[PDB]
Amino acid sequence: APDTSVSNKQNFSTDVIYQIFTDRFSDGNPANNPTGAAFDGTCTNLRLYCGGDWQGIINKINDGYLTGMGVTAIWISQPVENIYSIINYSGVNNTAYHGYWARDFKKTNPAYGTIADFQNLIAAAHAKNIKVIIDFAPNHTSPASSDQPSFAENGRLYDNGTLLGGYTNDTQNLFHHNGGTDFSTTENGIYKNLYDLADLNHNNSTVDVYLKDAIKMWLDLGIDGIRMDAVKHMPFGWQKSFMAAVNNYKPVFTFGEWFLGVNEVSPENHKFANESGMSLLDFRFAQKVRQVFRDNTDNMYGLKAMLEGSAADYAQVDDQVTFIDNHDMERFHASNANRRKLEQALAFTLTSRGVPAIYYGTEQYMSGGTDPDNRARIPSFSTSTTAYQVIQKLAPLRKCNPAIAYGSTQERWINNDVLIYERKFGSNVAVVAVNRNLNAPASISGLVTSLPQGSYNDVLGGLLNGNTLSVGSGGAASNFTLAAGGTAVWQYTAATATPTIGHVGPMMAKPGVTITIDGRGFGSSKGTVYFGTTAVSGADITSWEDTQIKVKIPAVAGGNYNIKVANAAGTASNVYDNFEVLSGDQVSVRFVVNNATTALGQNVYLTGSVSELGNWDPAKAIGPMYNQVVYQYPNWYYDVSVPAGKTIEFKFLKKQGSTVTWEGGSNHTFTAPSSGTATINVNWQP
Numbered sequence: 095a096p097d098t099s100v101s102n103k104q105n106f107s108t109d110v111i112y113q114i115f116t117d118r119f120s121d122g123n124p125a126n127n128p129t130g131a132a133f134d135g136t137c138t139n140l141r142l143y144c145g146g147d148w149q150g151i152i153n154k155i156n157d158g159y160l161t162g163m164g165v166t167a168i169w170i171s172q173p174v175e176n177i178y179s180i181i182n183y184s185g186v187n188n189t190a191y192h193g194y195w196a197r198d199f200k201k202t203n204p205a206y207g208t209i210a211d212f213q214n215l216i217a218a219a220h221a222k223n224i225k226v227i228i229d230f231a232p233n234h235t236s237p238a239s240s241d242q243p244s245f246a247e248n249g250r251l252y253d254n255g256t257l258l259g260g261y262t263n264d265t266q267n268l269f270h271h272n273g274g275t276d277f278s279t280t281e282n283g284i285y286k287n288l289y290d291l292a293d294l295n296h297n298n299s300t301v302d303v304y305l306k307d308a309i310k311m312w313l314d315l316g317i318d319g320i321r322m323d324a325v326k327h328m329p330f331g332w333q334k335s336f337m338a339a340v341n342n343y344k345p346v347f348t349f350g351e352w353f354l355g356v357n358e359v360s361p362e363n364h365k366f367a368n369e370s371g372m373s374l375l376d377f378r379f380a381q382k383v384r385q386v387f388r389d390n391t392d393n394m395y396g397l398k399a400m401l402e403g404s405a406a407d408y409a410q411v412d413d414q415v416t417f418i419d420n421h422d423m424e425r426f427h428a429s430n431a432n433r434r435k436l437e438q439a440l441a442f443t444l445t446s447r448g449v450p451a452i453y454y455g456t457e458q459y460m461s462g463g464t465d466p467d468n469r470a471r472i473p474s475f476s477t478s479t480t481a482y483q484v485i486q487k488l489a490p491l492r493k494c495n496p497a498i499a500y501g502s503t504q505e506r507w508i509n510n511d512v513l514i515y516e517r518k519f520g521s522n523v524a525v526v527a528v529n530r531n532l533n534a535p536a537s538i539s540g541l542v543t544s545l546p547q548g549s550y551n552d553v554l555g556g557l558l559n560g561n562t563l564s565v566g567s568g569g570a571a572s573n574f575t576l577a578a579g580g581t582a583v584w585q586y587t588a589a590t591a592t593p594t595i596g597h598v599g600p601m602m603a604k605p606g607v608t609i610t611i612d613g614r615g616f617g618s619s620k621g622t623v624y625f626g627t628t629a630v631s632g633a634d635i636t637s638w639e640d641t642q643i644k645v646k647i648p649a650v651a652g653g654n655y656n657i658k659v660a661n662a663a664g665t666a667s668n669v670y671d672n673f674e675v676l677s678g679d680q681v682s683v684r685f686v687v688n689n690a691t692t693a694l695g696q697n698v699y700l701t702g703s704v705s706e707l708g709n710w711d712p713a714k715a716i717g718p719m720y721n722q723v724v725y726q727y728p729n730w731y732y733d734v735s736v737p738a739g740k741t742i743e744f745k746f747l748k749k750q751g752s753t754v755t756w757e758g759g760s761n762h763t764f765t766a767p768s769s770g771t772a773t774i775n776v777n778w779q780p
């Protein structure tokens with residue numbers, strides 16, 4: 095199947111995701127609606143259930159609403175069984191309408207539907223070429239109070255109906271009992287509860303195994319991706335061992351939520367997207383887009399800088415999920431604002447690098463503040479708004495113009511208010527012009543592009559006041575005026591003759607798993623795939639077409655590899671880097687080192703004999719280790735994904751900048767569990 099097929103669960107770059115709060119979309123089955131105090135059919139009270147469900151979604155897929163818009167993926171609320179209690183929070187009643195308060199990860203939330211409703215949803219969507227993504231929130235269960243076990247459901251956790259345990263009398267230690275976070279440090283927001291949510295202890299084997307099993311069921315149900323909640327609040331090593339369980343079983347595209355504030359740029363965020371096995375919601379992009387197009391607190395120069403920086407900070411920039419708003423921000427559209435701002439931010443997002451996501455109702459110009467105000471019910475299913483038409487014209491280009499799905503981004507003209515950028519991939523080009531100045535036109539002279547000589551009509555047809563472009567030889571465009579609030583998209587598509595890889599997925603897996611290599615120019619005859627210097631050809635290449643190749647990872651040593659392909663004639667493609675071959679299946683193990691005293695600005699790291707521990711390379715050592723919460727300095731700890739059942743030799747080190755101090759003595763040693771978790775406690779050797 096081609097790269098753009100609904101069947102590609104490994105690549106969402108050619109899709110347009112539509113984000114839905116199931117409860118607030120469409121109630122197609124009134125019979126599963128909660129009753130009494132939990133329910134408000136008028137949806138005036140935004141904290142109760144309004145009744146939207148899977149049937150409703152199914153209906154909107156079949157009556158042409160989503161498909162007419164060009165949407166090709168839907169992202170829905172966590173589908174698992176939620177607590178049934180109404181929670182009064184100081185006078186205000188709250189329900190689990192959001193799906194974020196899990197009680198059993200093996201069953202469905204009956205307000206959304208039954209397992210059968212779930213399967214029908216997957217079927218309908220699939221039939222209309224729409225992929226299905228689900229929220230998955232394994233960080234916690236529900237609101238709990240340790241000494242008031244009668245509060246809510248005491249954070250109770252069931253395994254398909256069977257009680258595993260609760261927050262009060264947690265002898266099994268299913269949960270963390272370290273207090274609540276102040277979001278002060280990263281370590282602090284990981285090992286303590288968020289608010290009053292009962293925090294799962296992933297270092298407990300039962301929880302570990304339970305969650306890895308629960309996700310397999312959903313995979314088995316046909317899901318196409320997973321959106322992980324609170325990824326900055328769970329151990330990084332555990333999360334990696336979870337991605338491995340997914341990828342070594344049934345790989346799907348996974349992206350998590352790691353919130354970034356205005357002007358916030360975090361190296362821990364980049365390292366996580368670069369190394370964990372999953373990608374992230376692009377908050378850096380969204381916050382910037384809002385400053386520029388909404389709040390006017392930055393200009394084009396700041397947008398451009400975000401585009402260049404990000405392309406450099408993220409190893410796979412094309413996998414970061416972009417948006418202009420979501421359930422955690424006030425709606426982009428402010429009641430009294432010019433609609434053009436939203437139209438422009440949308441056009442920008444759709445033609446930009448990454449995987450775009452549209453929060454439901456955006457195309458209807460919904461306004462609203464923070465939670466729960468940004469979660470009202472979609473007021474209408476009209477296809478006549480300008481925003482709806484913007485999406486409708488632009489979304490499809492991601493499927494038909496690879497420059498949009500996979501190209502580089504390049505600024506070709508800029509000032510405070512105007513940005514002209516070009517996307518390029520193979521013999522494919524897209525040039526987009528944006529003038530945020532809603533009051534003044536701009537004189538554009540000196541624009542140089544890669545488009546071939548000719549005239550080009552605005553892809554939006556003048557919808558946002560775009561114009562035609564005339565490019566002469568050299569790619570130089572002739573002078574033109576870019577209207578106030580103007581937005582124009584111009585493009586050129588052609589066959590790519592040489593193999594060009596545009597995307598690889600999953601990005602991490604053990605030998606033997608099949609990965610998907612997407613791009614153009616691969617030809618229709620099997621060629622060769624190189625993992626590093628190792629050549630793979632023949633039968634292990636399970637499928638080969640011009641835009642997509644499926645091949646099993648060879649049994650090479652764990653480590654990081656570059657991928658390159660060569661057509662049947664031997665022409666090789668560009669190198670796609672950062673592909674991680676696992677040493678085997680993974681388990682999450684906690685390493686604890688006692689009495690490793692350090693100087694300021696000096697931290698302890700861990701290294702060892704397997705690629706998962708960096709193979710003795712201090713530049714690739716794991717850390718810095720933690721030393722506040724679970725163990726206190728001069729004791730350090732850390733949860734690490736390691737190959738299961740392997741005997742591993744390791745050592746700790748102290749780094750300062752790139753200056754390294756090794757532990758003395760001989761290597762510590764240990765044998766990883768075959769499943770479940772473990773804790774290895776040792777003392778630092780001088």
Ligand SMILES: OC[C@H]1O[C@H](O[C@H]2[C@H](O)[C@@H](O)[C@@H](O)O[C@@H]2CO)[C@H](O)[C@@H](O)[C@@H]1O
Binds near residue numbers: 539540
């Ligand atoms: O002409 C090549 C040139 O085009 C763009 O420069 C623009 C500039 O962004 C505008 O602010 C204005 O000064 O006109 C210039 C073109 O004459 C590109 O930004 C630039 O990199 C490139 O050299």
Ligand SMILES: OC[C@H]1O[C@H](O[C@H]2[C@H](O)[C@@H](O)[C@@H](O)O[C@@H]2CO)[C@H](O)[C@@H](O)[C@@H]1O
Binds near residue numbers: 691692694727
């Ligand atoms: O919170 C981690 C913190 O630990 C390390 O600093 C040690 C310091 O080296 C000791 O001399 C001592 O005073 O305790 C500190 C930990 O509280 C790193 O130096 C530091 O960068 C790191 O954040």
Ligand SMILES: OC[C@H]1O[C@H](O[C@H]2[C@H](O)[C@@H](O)[C@@H](O)O[C@@H]2CO)[C@H](O)[C@@H](O)[C@@H]1O
Binds near residue numbers: 758759
């Ligand atoms: O280079 C691989 C090598 O790294 C580690 O050796 C350390 C050693 O433990 C230190 O005491 C120190 O002198 O630096 C060496 C780095 O070369 C591993 O301990 C060793 O097994 C491994 O082969």
Ligand SMILES: [Ca+2]
Binds near residue numbers: 123145205
């Ligand atoms: Ca319903």
Ligand SMILES: [Ca+2]
Binds near residue numbers: 233284285327
């Ligand atoms: Ca946590």
